[PDB]
Design a protein. Sequence first.
Lengths: 156, 64, 107
Amino acid sequence: TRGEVAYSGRKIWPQKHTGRARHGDIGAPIFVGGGVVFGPKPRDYSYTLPKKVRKKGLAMAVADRAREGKLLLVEAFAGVNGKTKEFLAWAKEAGLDGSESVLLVTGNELVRRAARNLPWVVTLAPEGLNVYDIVRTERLVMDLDAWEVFQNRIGG
Amino acid sequence: PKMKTHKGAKKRVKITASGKVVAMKTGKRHLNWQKSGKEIRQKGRKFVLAKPEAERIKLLLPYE
Amino acid sequence: RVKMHVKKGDTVLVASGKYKGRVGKVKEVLPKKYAVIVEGVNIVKKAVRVSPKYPQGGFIEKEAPLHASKVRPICPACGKPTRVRKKFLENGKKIRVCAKCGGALDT
RNA sequence: GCCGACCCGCGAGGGCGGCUGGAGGUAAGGGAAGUGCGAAUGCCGGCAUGAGUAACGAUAAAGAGGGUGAGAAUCCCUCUCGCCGUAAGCCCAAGGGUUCCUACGCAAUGGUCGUCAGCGUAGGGUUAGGCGGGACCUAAGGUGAAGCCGAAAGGCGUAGCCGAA
RNA sequence: UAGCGGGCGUGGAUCCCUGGAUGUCCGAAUGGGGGAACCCGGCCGGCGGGAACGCCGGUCACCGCGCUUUUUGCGCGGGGGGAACCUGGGGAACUGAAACAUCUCAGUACCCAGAGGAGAGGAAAGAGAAAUCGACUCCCUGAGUAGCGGCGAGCGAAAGGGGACCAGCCUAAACCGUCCGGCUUGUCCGGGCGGGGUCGUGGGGCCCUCGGACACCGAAUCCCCAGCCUAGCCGAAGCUGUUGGGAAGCAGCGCCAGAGAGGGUGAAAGCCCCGUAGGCGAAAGGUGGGGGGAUAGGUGAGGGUACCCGAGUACCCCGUGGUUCGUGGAGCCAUGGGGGAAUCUGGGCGGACCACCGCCUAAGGCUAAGUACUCCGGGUGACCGAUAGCGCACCAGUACCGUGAGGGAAAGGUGAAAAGAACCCCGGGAGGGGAGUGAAAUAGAGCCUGAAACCGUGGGCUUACAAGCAGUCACGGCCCCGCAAGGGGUUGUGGCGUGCCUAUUGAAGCAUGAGCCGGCGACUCACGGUCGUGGGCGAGCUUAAGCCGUUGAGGCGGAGGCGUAGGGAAACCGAG
């Protein structure tokens, strides 16, 4: 701001017998780098969201996908090993082309890795769910680990 | 952040369990002598209202 | 330290912009500014006609500095990425299924 | 950005076209704000207004000839002319630090010009056993071992010490 | 920073990474001077044919500590630097209650000195009412309650409890020897030493009965190993056609992936390149109880005693300050002064005090953690983008300004690479004119864009009978677009026509600011309530810190707050 200027409190002008305007110390927003006023700061955008309604949304989100019928929870996979070929062939198994999205859901280190580089395979897993993620994406790939995750998440 | 909440007002007022700003009469001490029980019983209590709503914004947090 | 590009000092092929699709001579590497040149940008430079080092009419040039990431490795095969190898005596870099890199001096 | 005699909105504005320009842009659905100028004798910036006008810095003054160079009353070489001489001549202390000296140079600075410099680029120059100051002296004064005192800082301060035209 | 130039690299160079030499003089400066980089010497060696001059190397400051026969010294340390974070001796005023002296900013700036990656504190002479808790810092909440006040503005506890974190040992005095001086040689005044012991259910000293012990707690102490920091290393996968100066683009076919993070490349690239995901490494200097060892050390009953158990202290009174506490019944507690004990029958609180009753051990110390801050470093952004962002994107804490203190700036762009325009023409050059060059030469050397203000060239149109907020309306004349009708704009004739903004009951005003034009430019942030509302739950709604988790990843966590009953000053009653 206008007080934390790398200058001083020097009131150079008098007030009376001068010429042009009337000013205190150089530090004022009426000049150059002279501190601005009320603007941008390294602040904090944050607040609270009641679990109930919040988790309503959680359920509701996957529920909205459960309102279009775009999900699947495979047990064991053909692409268990974190290599691309097998996982793609298995994507052909489940019925997945090459222009979609993979908020997958599922919890398997192997799976997440191979599916991390593959372009349209943004990959999501369950210990940290997200409803933004499902709205923007589309494929609850699943193990019931993530579904059982849903259960104790929205229990009530 | 945490503000004062003023206890002068609190130490001389009492709203009616909602927001109807109500209290005590004004004008004792320097009367008496020349009168009777008339204004005596009548000094008892008071109503208070209208601008005491602004006064109701004055007090704030505690309610009480 | 930290100038480990992908070039050394011999011969390689070209895919640039000026004359994209040629090949590189001995390849004078100078400097660490990624400037590289073989016979590439053979334009024409001035230089005054003065009697000293210059003829009565000074107006000629040849090879001229150029960008480094404009070329690709090769070997007795075609021209593929150079993957390195421990010779357990020295250390060079073979080629996809095939071979040669610095293997002209007992490598 | 430029230009517009075309399209759209009651409007701020939105679209299309060509030239300039050469590597970005960012819908619809949303959102986060240094966000909208024309003034504040605004901060700044650029540039005009008077304006070919007042002035070229003490009313002691130049002339020619010749020379140089693209360019001369403006520099220079000699003939000629006036002004000072308690100073307007010479020195020292002071201060300024290459300004010096020379070859060249005018784009600046010079209150025009300038081949000229006191400016410029580069080189080259400042010699002490005797001058002058330091390997000698103190004065006012200061610092300061000691000492007195101050909450802190430090004040006060003997012997000593730096100290001068 | 180009160069001349003459030299070094697979008998392995620049180079970074490590240690060491070098480290001249100034600099707390330090022999001693002293105006900052100069000068003067006592001393040991060295050099000059070297005594007389000079340098080379060695030395030479002050305060605080123990030994040193007071001796000379020997060993020790010391000062001065520092952005903010912490502690202390003192210490303002601006302002604020719209006045002003108490109350306020404020113990904030300031001065000095100190201390450390932490500081500070810490084992209860504690809370305060639980006959209950159980060392210290931070947080949240208790609660803005309690409580203070020209009862004015305003100032603000802790206990509670839920979290971050958890660490515990000694002294003095008693007491037992031992060494040294004195001396009223005493069975003595003390002190240099060692063991003795540390208490709040009171402990122990010492003396006697138990049996008093290998083991046992094991360090904050020493010793290591794994692991971290300052050079590096492997690295998935593409080939052709094409517009062009350049393709990566659009197309064909093929591939890569623990790698689609980004940057480069003449442009927009997973597949060309540093690298990414992942995986891997150190001789040198430093880091580490995590695993471990050992070491320092620390662990047991009872009788009698009765020795001690912190002295100008505790305690009283006057002058004090903190604590929410302003003179209040003021308690505790920190101390200017005067006064002045005790040894567990010892003494500090429970808000004067008395009583009771609980609480509790002073007047001698120490202790990691958690906590804070940000110059330097990495991380990384609904952060800015050459008047912004630091005043500094560049030879900026620099040009310039004050005697100095101090004030302090303005300022980024050719290309992809200089290929930076050779040869020639006007000139004295400066600048141009042909060239070459590159896609591009209004990309040509201050070189992306290049508005307007402001200054100019030709030409198309008007204006010399004219009275003016210069504009607008009808018409016409002219020049150029339009096939048509139309239209540009030039402005002769007439109808009309009292500047912009401020301040005013009221202005074109001779009450005011403005040269023009360009830009930076002013209603905001966490929370605190209030009305509304779009939603959730609805007699129920909701978490704080903080914890597992994230590589832009969620979840959790009942401490606490409120709504449900109000009312009485209270005691208390109670839909009364």
